[PDB]
Amino acid sequence: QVEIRKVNQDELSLLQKIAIQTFRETFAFDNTAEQLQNFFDEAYTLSVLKLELDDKESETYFILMSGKAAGFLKVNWGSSQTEQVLEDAFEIQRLYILKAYQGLGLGKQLFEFALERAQISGLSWVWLGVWEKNVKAQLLYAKYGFEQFSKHSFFVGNKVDTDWLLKKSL
Amino acid sequence: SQVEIRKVNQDELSLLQKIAIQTFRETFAFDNTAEQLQNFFDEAYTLSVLKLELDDKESETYFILMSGKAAGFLKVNWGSSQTEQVLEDAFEIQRLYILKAYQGLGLGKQLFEFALERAQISGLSWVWLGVWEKNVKAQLLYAKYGFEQFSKHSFFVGNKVDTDWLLKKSL
Numbered sequence: 001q002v003e004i005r006k007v008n009q010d011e012l013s014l015l016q017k018i019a020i021q022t023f024r025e026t027f028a029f030d031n032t033a034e035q036l037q038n039f040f041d042e043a044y045t046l047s048v049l050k051l052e053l054d055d056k057e058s059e060t061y062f063i064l065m066s067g068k069a070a071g072f073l074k075v076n077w078g079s080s081q082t083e084q085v086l087e088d089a090f091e092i093q094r095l096y097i098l099k100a101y102q103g104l105g106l107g108k109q110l111f112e113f114a115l116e117r118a119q120i121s122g123l124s125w126v127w128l129g130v131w132e133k134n135v136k137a138q139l140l141y142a143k144y145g146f147e148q149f150s151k152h153s154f155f156v157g158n159k160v161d162t163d164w165l166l167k168k169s170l
Numbered sequence: 171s172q173v174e175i176r177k178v179n180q181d182e183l184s185l186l187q188k189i190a191i192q193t194f195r196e197t198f199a200f201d202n203t204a205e206q207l208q209n210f211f212d213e214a215y216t217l218s219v220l221k222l223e224l225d226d227k228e229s230e231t232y233f234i235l236m237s238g239k240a241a242g243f244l245k246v247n248w249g250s251s252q253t254e255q256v257l258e259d260a261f262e263i264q265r266l267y268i269l270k271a272y273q274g275l276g277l278g279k280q281l282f283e284f285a286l287e288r289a290q291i292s293g294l295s296w297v298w299l300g301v302w303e304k305n306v307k308a309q310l311l312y313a314k315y316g317f318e319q320f321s322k323h324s325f326f327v328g329n330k331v332d333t334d335w336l337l338k339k340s341l
Binding site: 161162 | 198201202206207209210213214302304305323325326327328329330333
């Protein structure tokens with residue numbers, strides 16, 4: 001019953017909807033509505049998502065359950081990567097599954113699809129960022145063969161944090 | 171007075187690294203672990219990164235000195251050296267730290283006012299800086315010099331979403 005394919009040009013509003021809903025589900029319990037809205041207002045307007053859909057060096061996919069969008073995947077290469085950290089590299093930037101569809105294995109299936117796209121790309125590396133404190137995710141990524149190669153620290157108010165960058169040889 | 175403000179000398183690179191590290195430690199050490207701070211030092215405050223900064227034609231770094239001793243520092247940017255391209259013909263105040271042993275003497279205000287005058291002399295149209303949405307005290311202070319919000323940037327760390335406001339002042 002499951003399909004994975006690129007977002008259609010005529011599904012821009014649908015994409016905005018699921019992107020907003022998943023962000024709300026992931027972040028709403030620990031942040032205020034206004035804080036979340038600040039992010040929507042910047043990252044998930046129809047015009048920004050439109051540029052992303054038209055970007056030649058990026059792809060956005062839906063994973064679907066019986067024809068209904070259950071989650072989405074954004075991948076980047078070339079100048080569209082969020083950061084230039086490796087040569088001949090492919091970035092997995094976004095992966096969200098709607099709560100109503102979690103626990104069904106769809107996340108794993110979409111992540112595995114992302115790795116196969118990377119393989120088919122003929123590039124040398126696939127990479128992603130993970131929070132220094134998210135050990136569970138780290139462990140999971142390590143099982144697919146990802147390894148740390150760099151990091152980026154920054155601060156918010158009084159709190160300093162770090163992201164690790166992990167790569168997998170293609 | 172006993173106070174001087176001037177560019178960091180080429181032969182003061184190590185001095186700069188020292189004060190940059192010490193001020194960061196003073197500002198952040200009570201709420202973060204030593205390892206977290208070291209991650210930042212290891213990336214931002216190595217001699218080689220600071221060297222590129224000192225050699226950068228579109229940026230300046232200044233010491234404020236008290237009786238010949240470095241008490242704090244100031245980094246300003248323009249052109250492509252700005253941390254973000256958000257305005258045209260703009261000048262950025264990126265870093266300003268005063269050593270704790272020298273706080274409360276008015277040196278911060280004096281260095282910020284020096285930064286605004288450099289901006290004026292630059293002939294550019296705007297001076298801007300970023301401030302944390304939650305730092306109301308700083309907001310209020312900035313507003314007194316004539317800064318106004320014009321944009322913002324949200325991001326997330328783990329489970330927490332945050333926002334920075336960008337403020338500009340007409341030159």
